[PDB]
From a paper:
Our crystal structures reveal that the PorXFJ adopts a two-domain dimeric fold with a classical RR receiver domain's fold and a unique alkaline phosphatase superfamily (APS) domain connected by a helical linker region. Each PorXFJ monomer adopts a two-lobed fold containing an N-terminal receiver (REC) domain (residues 1–120), followed by a three-helix bundle (THB) domain (residues 121–209) and a C-terminal APS domain (residues 210–517). All PorXFJ dimers adopt an intertwined assembly, where each monomer is symmetrically wrapped around the other monomer, forming an overall “X”-like shape.
The primitive orthorhombic crystal form gave rise to a single dimeric assembly (two monomers in the asymmetric unit), while the primitive monoclinic crystal form gave rise to two identical dimeric assemblies (four monomers in the asymmetric unit). In addition, in the primitive monoclinic crystal form, spherical densities, in dimensions suitable to accommodate sulfate ion (mimicking phosphate ion) originating from the crystallization condition, were clearly observed in the REC domain phosphorylation site. In support of this notion, in the primitive monoclinic crystal form, two phospho-mimicking sulfate ions were identified and modeled at PorXFJ's APS binding cavity. One sulfate ion was modeled next to the catalytic Thr271, while the other was located in an auxiliary binding cleft and stabilized by Arg275, Lys329, and Asn357. These findings further suggest that PorXFJ's potential ligand might not only be large but also include polyphosphate moieties such as cyclic di-nucleotides or polynucleotides.
Numbering used by the authors:
A (entry chain B), B (entry chain A): 2 to 517
Write the structure that this text describes.
């Protein structure tokens, strides 16, 4: 099976040197000197690729292209033309041409196009495979050598780079090697946090940017430039790899200006971390300064009701004098309504949007078999996230914002992790259920599995009484009650949970973009 | 905001004519003469794109590329080099280069690369929009000019071509124009079937290939070539557009040899149409010849239990002497098990796999808000299907089959349609609750909404008595019982159902592929 090329050109006899060149490289070329007969040939025969000129007496190559793609849209098509006109370039690109080569053409430039457009998947798979064999050892080495939070960020970015490259490989041996490096990463990172998290709360401490610092340290510098209105979107419960999975979709509308990885406070829970973003305060100080807004034990509905109030209070405290609105999207319909009415916010200095879709999807994975099959592993969950995003009102909002010349800031409260191993726990139940952190007056737990803080106020968290403590799951543990243990294990094994310590949960993107 | 180019080349002074050219076109170029300095610049500054030569004293461009992509993988990178070596070409392509231009390079070839890699999304949107304005009238005209089943097939393929192209459009006014052309198409197509379906059962009638013809007419010619073993996959309940949505994924492993649109029998239901594929018989003749296998009144689990038996009987009747096995996958775990054990089927002439995923996903949309948000429209359902497929055991099975040099045949029983408008119905308490067809001895219905067949034996369907009849929903109607009406209507409105007449349900792909 030689690769079969259909070349359409009214002057095809002048390109016979190119045809001989390709035929010596095991390509079979069929020629046509008009579009009509070329289309007929293309319907009847199976060609791997088509080359087209633009200028033909009968019908333009661009017309021929549109007709051919209607008949078989999966066939790559390359324009080989004398035309250097920007309008023709744009027409070709807009018609989903694979490449556009300007005559006179180096035969090897044509060969390149053939390899780039027919063999890329194979070449990338081969290259990625061979590279990761050489690189997996270096990553383990670097992982063993990590002794700073900045180094943890850098390592995490290396892991993610490779995790994404490996998702277009079929070899399971290699994928398991990476899954094991992630496990080792989280183990070592868990210990790092256990040893350093408390010191970060000492005065004048060297510490990463965290939830309660975020708005003041990273958003306000963008506001104070006073060059553009800002859409500040907090996508609830987004992992760094989920961001990566739709980075390229966003890059069509927005150019990245700044990317700062930052750290969620503990617990890595929406009620604590996300409220902290908006308040600019640790949860202890939200309880002290806003007792009417802050909730400790609460049912699932009522954890993040006062974010607008928190944010406006912070904006006042920082003495910004800005037109600013807050919206929380909790469903499709609300999303649509904001995309439809977004024009009305042109006058604003700041529009802040919380987008809840994740944590309804993570919940769905626990409850139904189909969502489990769609999110079987992290690769699938990334795929499913990308699908959601591509077809979400959130992307429509971003599109709107770009048309109105808004700056886009994109971040999240905290990520999630696939939990695998149950760790036993006893203690009177909280109203809302979390599987990676607990707070209580009499908590029983396996100490090896959890970071324990016996004096919560030292890390900016509320204490119910003098005895109270917090525990945070490490690794991929989930905290299972001893009563009902077997059903807890069956239900929640291999679900996405949050609240504890992992790279996925704790290290998260903050992203600034300018519209294109 | 000029577009910012970083150009790395030890001989950058020789490229000053190119830089002047680009600077007149509103590009800003920053130059570097070695990879190290270039990497430093790339970390510090935000470049839209990077140009690299290969041959440099310090570092290979290929090395520089790998370093840069690790730091920011979303930035396109173009190699501009004297090198015509296939290994360098392949390394660049394998490293995810965006384009590879061979010096000396026409400045306009560079301009093309810039536009293709930075502006394609916009250019495609603009071109698709402008093209559909010019085409929408011609589509309506083509719909008016339909006088044959072949014409219906061609029209359906035109509609699908445009529906997918308009996926890349934000303008809703134009999308609604197309949705309305589809509605008119289904209206007219419903009437076509109403007028022609019975006459198609006369021999000597000009008729499309249908379920009961499929295996004999289209699979057996491939078996009788005796050149390769065949994996015959029936993806349960797949629409043509769902196939289109993952056509390119499959094209990495398999080259399309043949595509025949064919027509599902009525009802467009798995119990009738899929059993007919395997039996080679209409349901009436399955009842007569295989009473033990055919079931009229059966639970949803008991509808397609005897497909292996039907198929082996057909293979015998056609006097083929082939090693043939059948598998029905009903869950992830079963899918995995077959992909893991596929090597063991090396000797087989035919492997037949029924893959049930899609019917469960449509039920999920009905029962859960999250699936509804992920499949809000047909575009989202296509996106969600693509995601499933990319991460499915079915693709693993296909991959295995390709490694073993199997020919791939891909088809489906019938599609599904988003139902919108209830049509009232009484009677027909059949065990399973299908929403687009009913059979019973005394049916009350709105006759405008349904194709009615008073004597089922005339269209190859079973009749409980001479009073029995069948009804098939047209357009986007669903059959709603009068009892509990309001809750029935809320539950099933905007769900994917099947059993009736539409382009989506009835016209479906049969696809033959050779392995790559
Ligand atoms: Mg010409
Ligand atoms: Mg050089």
């Amino acid at each position: 099976d030689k690769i079969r090329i259909l070349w359409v050109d009214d002057e095809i006899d002048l390109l016979k040197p190119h045809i001989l060149f390709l035929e010596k490289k095991n390509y079979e070329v069929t020629t046509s000197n008009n579009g009509l007969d070329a289309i007929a040939l293309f319907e009847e025969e199976n060609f791997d690729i088509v080359f087209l000129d633009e200028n033909m007496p009968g019908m333009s190559g661009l017309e021929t292209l549109s007709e051919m793609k209607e008949k078989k849209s999966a066939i790559p098509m390359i324009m080989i033309t004398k035309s250097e006109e920007e309008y023709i370039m744009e027409e070709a690109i807009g018609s989903k041409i694979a490449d556009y080569l300007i005559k006179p053409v180096n035969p090897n430039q044509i060969l390149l196009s053939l390899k780039k457009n027919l063999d890329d998947s194979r070449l990338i798979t081969e290259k990625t495979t061979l590279d990761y064999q050489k690189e997996f050892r270096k990553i383990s080495m670097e992982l063993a050598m990590v002794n700073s939070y900045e180094d943890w960020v850098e390592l995490y970015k290396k892991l993610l780079f490779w995790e994404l490259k490996l998702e277009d490989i079929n070899d399971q041996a290699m994928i398991e090697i990476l899954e094991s490096q992630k496990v080792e990463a989280n183990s070592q990172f868990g210990k790092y946090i256990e040893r350093n998290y408390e010191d970060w709360f000492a005065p004048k401490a060297d510490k990463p940017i965290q939830s309660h610092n975020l708005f003041k340290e990273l958003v306000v510098p963008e506001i104070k430039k006073k060059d553009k209105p800002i859409l500040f979107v907090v996508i609830d419960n987004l992992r760094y790899d989920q961001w990566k999975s739709f980075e390229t979709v966003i890059s069509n509308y927005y150019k990245l200006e700044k990317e700062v990885p930052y750290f969620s406070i503990l617990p890595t829970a929406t009620q604590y971390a996300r409220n902290a973003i908006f308040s600019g305060l640790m949860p202890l100080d939200m309880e002290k300064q806003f007792p009417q807004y802050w909730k400790n034990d609460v049912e699932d509905g009522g954890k993040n009701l006062y974010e607008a109030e928190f944010l406006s209070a912070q904006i006042k405290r920082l003495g910004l004098n800005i037109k600013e609105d807050y919206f929380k999207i909790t469903n499709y319909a609300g999303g649509k309504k904001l995309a439809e009415n977004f024009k009305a916010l042109k006058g604003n200095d700041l529009v802040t949007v919380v987008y809840n879709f994740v944590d309804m999807l993570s919940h769905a994975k626990t409850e139904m078999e189909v969502v489990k099959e769609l999110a079987s592993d992290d690769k699938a969950y990334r795929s499913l996230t990308l699908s959601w995003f591509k077809n979400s009102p959130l992307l429509e909002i971003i599109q709107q914002a770009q048309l109105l010349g808004f700056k886009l800031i994109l971040t999240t409260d905290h990520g999630t992790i696939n939990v695998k191993n149950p760790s036993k726990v006893v203690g009177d139940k909280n109203t809302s259920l979390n599987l990676r952190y607990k707070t209580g007056r009499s908590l029983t737990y396996e100490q090896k599995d959890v970071y324990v803080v016996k004096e919560p106020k030292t890390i900016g968290l509320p204490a119910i009484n003098m005895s109270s403590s917090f525990i945070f799951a490490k690794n991929d543990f989930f905290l299972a009650y001893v009563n009902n243990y077997n059903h807890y294990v069956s239900y929640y094994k291999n679900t996405y949970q949050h609240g504890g310590i992992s790279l996925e949960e704790m290290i998260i993107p903050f992203l600034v973009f300018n519209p294109k």
